[PDB]
Amino acid sequence: LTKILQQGTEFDTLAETVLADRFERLVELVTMMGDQGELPIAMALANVVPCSQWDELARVLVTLFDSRHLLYQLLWNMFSKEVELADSMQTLFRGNSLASKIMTFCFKVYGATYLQKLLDPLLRIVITSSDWQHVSFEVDPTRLEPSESLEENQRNLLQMTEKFFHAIISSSSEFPPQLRSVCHCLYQVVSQRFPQNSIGAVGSAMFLRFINPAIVSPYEAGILDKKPPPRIERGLKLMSKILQSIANHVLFTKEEHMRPFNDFVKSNFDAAR
Amino acid sequence: TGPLSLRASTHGLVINIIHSLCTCSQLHFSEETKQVLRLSLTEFSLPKFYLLFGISKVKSAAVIAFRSSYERETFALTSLE
């Protein structure tokens, strides 16, 4: 079967070659990109497609332009639309739109290996060491049981935050090149959009759609094969919230128990930047 | 060094090392680097490198690496070079 399978292009049918040529011509038909302007097929499909197919469209688009090595320009056009369609710096790309679906699929297909390799040792510390420690993670005074201590939970949660954050800052050197290209493509158009915290919105989206979803749901990511204990789950949700507040360059307001953590959040602004 | 099984196992070790060296996304090598590694894998597949590794007369190293399931030649340092 191997030697049959690699036989060549002389044994295939006329129907097969005509079908292949017609498919290739259709693929080229999309990938024609005119000078000084965005690619026409993508602009049509961005504004025509019903919502129920939107993510599916994103998927095939990510499968296409990357295999033609043109993924950078596709992302350029999509973000170039999204920067003027969205006004507020907080509301940029957070809502359900095609830019969100495309960058979410890009994170899922590219950074899975990097995210898993970064995340599993900080997981394994919790799996064994802090588990027999059984350090509690309740910081809400109303949700706190009387037996537990507020300050000890806060200190454990704090130490866990610096461990995770410093692990990411250490792994700053390690990214796949495609993900870095995606971040660069986002950053350039965002800097065109505003001169204030162009890097900051990049960081907020970066923690928003890639980092924090794995932290809240490690089992759903497939990094951890088992469902963790619920105290650890609550703590990991708190990790995601605090790191998101770091990325947003703003401190907690409603949670009084997060107010001491605001100093550590604002302390790490420049390192994260 | 050693019997036929360990020498064949060493050859399989070298081949698997290069094979996993090119086929992994962790290292994210360049394309030309992958080309020269692909060339190196082919040149280690050659019978000349069988005779360098001390395995002679054996068609497939992978077959006799597991042959129990289913020292006479001297060693020269130029082959090691």
Q: What's the CA gap between A40 and A61, in Å, rounded? A: 13
Return the DSSP state at A207.
I
Set of chain B residues whose Cβ sits within 8 Å of the Cβ of A110: none
Set of chain A residues whose Cβ sits within 8 Å of the Cβ of B26: 113, 117
Set of chain A residues whose Cβ sits within 8 Å of the Cβ of B25: 113, 176
Q: What's the CA gap between A72 and A191, in Å, rounded? A: 17
Residue A118 has phi, psi (to 5 degrees) of: -70, -40
Q: Terminus-to-terminus CA distance in chain A, angstroms? A: 55
Set of chain A residues whose Cβ sits within 8 Å of the Cβ of B23: none
Q: State whether B25 and A176 contact (CB < 8 Å).
A: yes
Both tokens of A251, joined, read 């401190």
**Chain A residue with Cα closest to B30:** A177
| Stated resolution in angstroms | 3.7
Q: What is the DSSP string of A214-262?
A: HHH-HHHHTSSSSPPPHHHHHHHHHHHHHHHHHHTT---SS-STTTTHH
Q: State whether B25 and A177 contact (CB < 8 Å).
A: no
Report CA-CA distances (Å) from B80 to A43, B5, B49, B53, B76: 61, 19, 11, 9, 7
Q: What's the CA gap between A37 and A34, in Å, rounded? A: 6
Set of chain A residues whose Cβ sits within 8 Å of the Cβ of B28: 176-177
Set of chain B residues whose Cβ sits within 8 Å of the Cβ of A117: 26
Count of A-B CB contacts under 8 Å? 6
CB of A75 within 8 A of CB of A102?
A: yes
Q: Is any Cβ of chain A less than 8 angstroms from the Cβ of B26?
A: yes
**Chain A residue with Cα closest to B28:** A176
**Cα-based torsion angle of the residue sequence A144, A150, A154, A155 in order, rounded to the nearest 10 degrees:** -140
Residue A196 has phi, psi (to 5 degrees) of: -110, 115
Q: State whether B28 and A113 contact (CB < 8 Å).
A: no
Return the DSSP state at A192.
H
Q: State whether B26 and A177 contact (CB < 8 Å).
A: no
Q: State whether A177 and B28 contact (CB < 8 Å).
A: yes
Q: Is any Cβ of chain A less than 8 angstroms from the Cβ of B28?
A: yes
**Cβ neighbour number for residue A103 with a 10 Å cutoff:** 25
Min Cα separation B24/chain A (Å):
11
